[PDB]
Structure formats: C-alpha cells, structure tokens
UniProtKB/Swiss-Prot annotation:
This is Homeobox protein Hox-B13. It comes from Homo sapiens (Human). The keyword DNA-binding applies. Heterodimer with MEIS1. Heterodimer with MEIS2. It is linked to Prostate cancer, hereditary, 9: A condition associated with familial predisposition to cancer of the prostate. Most prostate cancers are adenocarcinomas that develop in the acini of the prostatic ducts. Other rare histopathologic types of prostate cancer that occur in approximately 5% of patients include small cell carcinoma, mucinous carcinoma, prostatic ductal carcinoma, transitional cell carcinoma, squamous cell carcinoma, basal cell carcinoma, adenoid cystic carcinoma (basaloid), signet-ring cell carcinoma and neuroendocrine carcinoma. GO terms for molecular function: DNA-binding transcription factor activity, RNA polymerase II-specific; DNA-binding transcription repressor activity, RNA polymerase II-specific; methyl-CpG binding; RNA polymerase II cis-regulatory region sequence-specific DNA binding; sequence-specific DNA binding; sequence-specific double-stranded DNA binding. GO terms for biological process: angiogenesis; epidermis development; epithelial cell maturation involved in prostate gland development; negative regulation of transcription by RNA polymerase II; prostate epithelial cord arborization involved in prostate glandular acinus morphogenesis; regulation of growth; regulation of transcription by RNA polymerase II; response to testosterone. The gene is HOXB13. The chain holds residues 217 to 273 of 284 of the full protein.
Length: 70
C-alpha cells in the first residue's frame, strides 16, 4: 500500500473496457485504417497514436527474438 511493496504499480495501461475494443479490432486485422482508428478513439477514448502503438506492439511481439520475454 505504501511501503514493503516489490513494485506492482504503473502496470500495463488501457483498461479492460479499452483493450476490449482494441483486441477485437486486432483479431479482425493486425493493422487498422484512419477510419477504424478514429472510431476506436471514440469508444476507448484513446488517441489515434496510442491505439496504433498498441496494435504495433501486438504484432512486433511475434516479430522480434523473444516470444516469452517480459
């Protein structure tokens, strides 16, 4: 709570309600367009850039050498 904590703060961003739309859109297409990207920003209330960064990390995750690295 205050002290004696290894460090479980500043964890992964994007709430379940936000990632819910991202994950779904991703499953449909690894890459979105200005259109979809704009819609998601209206639902998840995220920035066109933020959403992109997430979609990229999702793909790159299986591109670089490190499937189980984190």
């Amino acid at each position: 709570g205050s002290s004696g904590s290894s460090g479980r703060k500043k964890r992964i961003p994007y709430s379940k309600g936000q990632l819910r739309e991202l994950e779904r859109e991703y499953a449909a297409n690894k890459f979105i367009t200005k259109d979809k990207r704009r819609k998601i920003s209206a639902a998840t209330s995220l920035s066109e850039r933020q959403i992109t960064i997430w979609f990229q990390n999702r793909r790159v995750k299986e591109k670089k050498s490190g499937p189980s690295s984190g």
